[PDB]
Design an enzyme around this catalytic site. Sequence first.
Site: not given
Ligand code: Y7L
Ligand code: PLG
Ligand code: PLG
Lengths: 457, 456, 457, 456
Positions: D54, D56, D209, D235, D238, D244
């Site tokens: 992870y 992020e 695109d 993408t 292609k 992908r």
């Molecule tokens: N409880 C919780 N825990 C965890 C750990 C991982 N994730 C997954 C997602 C990790 C990202 C968490 C954030 C992204 C942006 C934030 C924010 O508030 N940004 C403002 C102000 C910032 C500043 O002024 O310092 C801005 O920059 O606009 S918080 C999460 C989660 O979803 N919830």
């Molecule tokens: C111009 C263009 N933009 C975006 C996408 C979206 O890509 P993903 O499928 O990876 O999300 C495609 C997919 N085109 C499918 C095809 O031409 O058969 C595309 O042809």
């Molecule tokens: C409850 C929950 N739902 C959705 C997502 C989104 O998954 P993707 O990052 O694969 O899009 C997360 C990721 N959580 C990040 C963390 O807890 O560290 C999660 O904790």
Amino acid sequence: WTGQESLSDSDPEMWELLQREKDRQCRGLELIASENFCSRAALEALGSCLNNKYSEGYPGKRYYGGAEVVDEIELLCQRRALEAFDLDPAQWGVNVQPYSGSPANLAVYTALLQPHDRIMGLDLPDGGHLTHGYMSDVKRISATSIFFESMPYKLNPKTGLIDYNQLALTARLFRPRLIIAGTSAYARLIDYARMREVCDEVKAHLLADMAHISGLVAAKVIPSPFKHADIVTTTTHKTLRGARSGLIFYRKGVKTGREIPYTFEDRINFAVFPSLQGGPHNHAIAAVAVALKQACTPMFREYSLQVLKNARAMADALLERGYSLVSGGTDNHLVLVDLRPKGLDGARAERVLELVSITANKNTCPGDRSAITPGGLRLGAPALTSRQFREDDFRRVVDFIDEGVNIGLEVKSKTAKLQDFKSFLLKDSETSQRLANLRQRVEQFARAFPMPGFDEH
Amino acid sequence: WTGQESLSDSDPEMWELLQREKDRQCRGLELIASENFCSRAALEALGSCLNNKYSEGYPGKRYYGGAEVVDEIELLCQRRALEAFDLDPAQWGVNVQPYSGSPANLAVYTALLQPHDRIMGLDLPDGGHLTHGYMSDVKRISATSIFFESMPYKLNPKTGLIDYNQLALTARLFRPRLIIAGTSAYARLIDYARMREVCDEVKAHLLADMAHISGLVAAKVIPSPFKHADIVTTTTHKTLRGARSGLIFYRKGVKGREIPYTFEDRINFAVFPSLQGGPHNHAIAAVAVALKQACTPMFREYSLQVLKNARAMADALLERGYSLVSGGTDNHLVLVDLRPKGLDGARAERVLELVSITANKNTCPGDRSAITPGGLRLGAPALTSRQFREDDFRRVVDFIDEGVNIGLEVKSKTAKLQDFKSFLLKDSETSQRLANLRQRVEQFARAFPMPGFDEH
Amino acid sequence: WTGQESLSDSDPEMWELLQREKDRQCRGLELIASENFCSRAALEALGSCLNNKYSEGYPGKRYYGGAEVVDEIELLCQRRALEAFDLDPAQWGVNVQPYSGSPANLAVYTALLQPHDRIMGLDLPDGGHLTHGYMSDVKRISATSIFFESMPYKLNPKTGLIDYNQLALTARLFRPRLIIAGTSAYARLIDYARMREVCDEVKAHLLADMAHISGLVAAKVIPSPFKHADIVTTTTHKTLRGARSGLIFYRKGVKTGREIPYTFEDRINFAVFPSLQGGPHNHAIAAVAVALKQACTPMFREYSLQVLKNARAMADALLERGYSLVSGGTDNHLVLVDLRPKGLDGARAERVLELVSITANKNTCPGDRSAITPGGLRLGAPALTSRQFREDDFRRVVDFIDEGVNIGLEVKSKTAKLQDFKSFLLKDSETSQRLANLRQRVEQFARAFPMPGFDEH
Amino acid sequence: WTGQESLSDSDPEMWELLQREKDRQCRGLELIASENFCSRAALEALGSCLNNKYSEGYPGKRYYGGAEVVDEIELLCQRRALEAFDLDPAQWGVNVQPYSGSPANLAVYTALLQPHDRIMGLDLPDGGHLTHGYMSDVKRISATSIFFESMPYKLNPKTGLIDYNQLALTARLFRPRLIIAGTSAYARLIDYARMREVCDEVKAHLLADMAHISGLVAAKVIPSPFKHADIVTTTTHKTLRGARSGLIFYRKGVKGREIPYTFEDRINFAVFPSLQGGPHNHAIAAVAVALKQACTPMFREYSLQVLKNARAMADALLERGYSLVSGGTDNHLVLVDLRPKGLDGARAERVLELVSITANKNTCPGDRSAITPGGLRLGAPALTSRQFREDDFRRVVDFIDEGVNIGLEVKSKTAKLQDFKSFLLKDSETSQRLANLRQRVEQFARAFPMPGFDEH
Ligand SMILES: Nc1nc2ccn(CCCCCc3ccc(C(=O)N[C@@H](CCC(=O)O)C(=O)O)s3)c2c(=O)[nH]1
Ligand SMILES: Cc1ncc(COP(=O)(O)O)c(CNCC(=O)O)c1O
Ligand SMILES: Cc1ncc(COP(=O)(O)O)c(CNCC(=O)O)c1O
Ligand SMILES: Nc1nc2ccn(CCCCCc3ccc(C(=O)N[C@@H](CCC(=O)O)C(=O)O)s3)c2c(=O)[nH]1
Ligand SMILES: Nc1nc2ccn(CCCCCc3ccc(C(=O)N[C@@H](CCC(=O)O)C(=O)O)s3)c2c(=O)[nH]1
Ligand SMILES: Nc1nc2ccn(CCCCCc3ccc(C(=O)N[C@@H](CCC(=O)O)C(=O)O)s3)c2c(=O)[nH]1
Ligand SMILES: Cc1ncc(COP(=O)(O)O)c(CNCC(=O)O)c1O
Ligand SMILES: Cc1ncc(COP(=O)(O)O)c(CNCC(=O)O)c1O
């Protein structure tokens, strides 16, 4: 055809209808808290040649010509608006073109908010108005809940007062961009300072909708919302006793060495025209100006003080006869009667009082589960007070109401559903004449009082 | 204090303003196509005790009581509205509560569309109204372009007519759910059959905004939009010669099964409780008075007169030295093109106003500027109600011609538009030249009768 | 050029970078609660020729041809998805194409809600995820708060638990159309029945986002949200120990004699494709199928039970060494450490633990006023448990953490702002080598454990 | 259990499916214009331990720690992306985290537009992609038409080219803030200079695109959209022959004052945290591998080959009896019109699939039907990576010709499309006629080399 013939001569069908309504207002006890009797002076401006003038735009910034006079009328209305509310023209501006109260509020939201920005107001059954964002659990009712996202705040059902604590809690979660401090059915004073603190915390605009209490505000008999509100909207046909129109008051001037300016004026004015409305109704603007001048007089302060005393007397009288009132009393022009401790719902009472020429509206009490049959009535002093009603006269009003409630209680005994109740009032001979007797004694009592406006229409 | 004191006794400051405005309408030649002189009968109803009555809801479905009389007032207004336009009460209904024209249109969109649903109207500089969805290249102007997504259709820039082909082309790309066939500054007639065909194809609602031409439609003097439009909105003033109000006509009844029309409930709900609060019962009553006048044989002769005084104004204008947009008026107004005369439509409006002729600048096809449009909008309905006839209307054209010519002489001695107007009030040669006309303008107009009260 | 050359031969720059990351995972104590070590079997499917196949559409309803095999892969993934969670294929369906967890949730909102319809989730600093509608007081952060209107629910800052009472109160005012029962940083079990009651009252969809706890749910070691949720979304790369992907489980079948049917399937499937996504990542779908088969084994139930015991042991160990934990303990895979009663903020602790190869994330504790310096850390068992860590091993992890906290406490003494802290860890020789000693003892301890996946990448 | 067991040992059911799919790609002639055969080097990175991390955030601005290695992986992918397209790192930046092409576009709209802001793209039946705002006359299809307001631009229905004039006309009416110059089914080249001119006039963002043509652009084999486009999405599969994934290229730096470009922060924020969660670092790494391959002299010779095998396919197709849309291919695919051959594009696709030729039905200008489109989309990139050359590509055209002709013979004996396919599997005369071809199809394709692993 000249266009100068009389209504009585040109359209007797309509002319008699006007007279029928004038008799109805003259003979009835009008207790609708939002109703008043407009002065002849204002009505003369309302039905004037100012109807003929298109004046889209604003004084000094119009889109056509020929607005030389209506510019002075609109400017005079603005000055009289600020004068009536003791506003410094360097700190406050006013738009006088809103067609009514609902257009006034929608203009404010359009001016200050983006579509789907969030709004908070007192819930409609809790005493808030539609234009404060009313949604039911099934349908978006008011357009202020369609074009903007609204969450209501509620009353404390123990006190009958606005739950300022729950408003502060939910506002930090909902994060509204505007909060409405204003009511349609609330007997108590509003803590505008507390509303201001909530708005300052969640960084929202405080809008005060003083429609019902505007006349009391102008007479300085109750505290003014202009001390805490950024924006103030009002109706002109309620306690202000004017033609049906609306106003938007906004702040002007100063809001690390930087002078932060207020940006309401241009946005508010643009929202009213050209965004929302077309040509201003200059006849309404003029009629409002006439009533606003009347609101600066010592006569109007006497009138507004009487409205206060007649509502307290109406409240006291109801309390003495076994009625409870939501929030226990009143500090303004209206009373919220709770009819549940007497066995009659506000729907039945409203219809039975209407058949004896007492005009009120059913009202929802805290805890009501039904809207077909609310448990209360809203009664207002302003209209009859303009007919020179005094405290003793309003105690007689309460004694007519008590007779109507008893007649309704006797009919609920003999009927089942609500429609059986309403038809029984017309088809049962015994109660039909018993109603006719009370109606006659109501109308004889009301006819004797003077009535603002014209004599015959 | 009784509330029965006269305005002249209680508020002399306002009373003098009222008298000043009545004098202004009596002494001037009113050529604003959207203005008219309301009858005394309607004005007496407009300023009546009906102002005092809150009657939220609709007849038979109000939310409090005491509406015994205003129910019949509203129903009579409804019956008179359908009667005035020759509508079968089983196929058409009317809402008579819209506060004005702009609220009438906004209610229709609210009733039939979701927020951000798409609408098509004639562009404002092309002669469409704000409430038809006007946004500029810089700003969303009308709320009909904020709460709904609008794309304008345009004129053929040298035919002067609506480019119905380009509108049909763009409608299949934009896919609007409602198109507005209606204008504020258009001298010709609208092909409602063609608009319906475009609307029927892209499966859109056809709404006709006949505000400007409503009186001509009621007198059966011009083709009626009710033959092809699903919904019709209008103002009650303008050619209807009534109080300031609005109306929404909607289709009703039946549209292998029976599909019924579903406009009524949505329209009524949009007007109240969605958009408006309490109806202005005095306006509704005054409107009913004017609608009854629209059923008269008198009104057809009045509306027939307005056409010929506009055709006479157009014919006279074609002479002297003016070209007019679309080449030929077929309604109550004329779109005069002042570019082939060296004078912009903005300065001509100001010079005419100082000589007591009130018109509005208008943008002609090809205008490279909005500070100075290239035309004027002139309307017959107002003066026609003062019993003006074709001979009276040919004299206004050359009263205007003295104004256009006098205005050309000062642009000689000035540069910008601010210097233009400034010279009109400070140069003793033109202020006298203005006053000299100004008396003969007022002397000529005062002699005609004036609907309404004598003094206010 | 053949396209069959090795990564080590064709791109040594990238190949070494892969090896550097593999060494980093092998030598570190990975305590990110959302991280796991994917099996070689799944990775072999992840990096396969299934990358080459466009299969837009669904099995039996595709838009091209040549999907004969990937239809069977996608169908097999669906069956293994339902099997792993003990779901009756007549009551439940699953979409296996969501690219990740965030795409899964956005698909659900798009499927069931209109733009600007309202959403309620646990606030992000309270332990909810971005995709549950996170807005700050200044900015719309997650797109789930841009395209939809979100109001958060909060923890009870006394218990550290979800305030189900305040959620019930505010849901009746906000009237959401969907509520998210699911967390990113919550150590306790979620009252899905209570969430169900709130949703049933305000007539909202209950969505369960079981991403963090999905593996525990599949092993039937904690209660299953499928007993109360209408929709269930999850990540496949957390406790499910699979490739990075997402799943949407939805109900099927029966929801006055009328049989009310579920309408989730068609709307959900249409939202994923063609509304939101393009071609499915069949290599990810296959890798997920491999891990889902692993989730039905008795081996995985043993694994998930160990994750529970190692988090309780980690919690117990922290408690014994003077640390408080939000909500006082844990019933799942993670621990929320409150570092405020020890004088070190979670930001400083996270960086100092990272320099000694202990990977955690700062976490906001209830009452935190700063986001630059939160007062806690989130620690998770799943990753190291997959390396055959047992309870005693996690007590040694806590003893390494305690050394890092002490080193950080000594540096906050000698530094002022946060940047002075972080630079002091690299530029001060005494602490630089003191860190290097702890890092070495951390890495020696972790390297000895087995590691899922390939040996060298 | 260790997690180090082989897929073949631990999951034989899945392992056989993998082998079956690899056999299917090895034995068939893959003509889907959007498909390619990924290199072993990229696939080994795609299925790597980078799945476990992870990370992020963005390099230097992540929200936890432990991203020491993946920061350099992402930065190397960024550097390789800009290098592969000859971009100055001071004028262009790239986001390498989009999960695929559809997320890449949705991030751009989210970054630059407000909800319901307006976008213009080529209509899907005209050759545009879903994510360019496709809504039909019945339904909003792509989320790019739900969260944003889309109007399509169309082809000239017999020129086969984009109607750039009609697009310029409608852009001033629709007033979009972003226009997408990019296609999924278009055989000619896009006038990016003209698109910018339209965009510069209506003050809209030009996004290109280039998903389908990205590889041809990187090899400097076709004109590059980066000369006129503000933002470029693509993408990574292609023609780029990668895993992908998706990329968003944006302009950076300086745009009487100095106005700087403000794309970077908005784009990056839209991707994370607005739209996506954790990056797929294995996909990013595999993409970096393929981007490095795109800088090779080998890749230019590969991309140059794809053009000539598409031109050879087009030339060969023009013979035999096929007309092709736009009259001439200039890229990697050919739009063949099968209406002048009595066979619809839908049934031809099915008959080719049973004989191991995989293509997709496509709508040609004038198609009165979507159940049965009038064309096929055929692509060179996939077989070209199998070292197919022009002579090899002229044989596929007549392998197709046996398929089109064999399909015509069964429509003889059947009526609807269901009866069509049903006869292909139950009639012993055609199932053998299908198998007879099916062996010579697979025998011919198996002989060519195949990128990737040998067995999966
Ligand atoms: N409880 C919780 N825990 C965890 C750990 C991982 N994730 C997954 C997602 C990790 C990202 C968490 C954030 C992204 C942006 C934030 C924010 O508030 N940004 C403002 C102000 C910032 C500043 O002024 O310092 C801005 O920059 O606009 S918080 C999460 C989660 O979803 N919830
Ligand atoms: C111009 C263009 N933009 C975006 C996408 C979206 O890509 P993903 O499928 O990876 O999300 C495609 C997919 N085109 C499918 C095809 O031409 O058969 C595309 O042809
Ligand atoms: C409850 C929950 N739902 C959705 C997502 C989104 O998954 P993707 O990052 O694969 O899009 C997360 C990721 N959580 C990040 C963390 O807890 O560290 C999660 O904790
Ligand atoms: N406290 C308060 N009091 C007063 C008195 C007058 N007004 C001014 C406005 C008067 C109108 C009040 C309403 C209109 C529609 C309603 C509604 O809920 N309609 C639903 C369900 C109805 C059903 O199912 O019976 C529907 O029909 O869709 S309530 C108000 C006010 O604003 N607030
Ligand atoms: N056919 C027709 N004719 C006539 C004559 C009067 N009206 C009634 C409408 C009156 C004019 C309304 C406006 C239109 C455009 C505006 C504008 O451009 N405003 C500025 C804002 C700031 C600025 O002051 O620069 C901008 O956005 O740039 S204002 C109409 C009509 O509706 N339709
Ligand atoms: N140039 C181009 N070519 C190609 C080839 C594949 N794709 C990838 C896109 C694959 C097809 C996506 C869809 C488009 C229209 C749909 C539709 O009409 N759906 C029904 C819903 C119910 C029904 O099943 O009837 C309706 O709304 O009526 S579905 C593309 C592409 O993007 N662009
Ligand atoms: C507080 C408030 N605001 C706005 C309005 C709207 O005014 P118009 O009806 O003029 O649009 C009302 C009307 N209130 C109606 C009643 O209390 O009976 C009101 O009470
Ligand atoms: C066609 C049309 N529709 C609606 C309106 C709005 O009416 P109100 O101004 O009463 O809201 C107007 C006003 N037109 C102004 C003019 O032509 O001068 C109009 O011309």
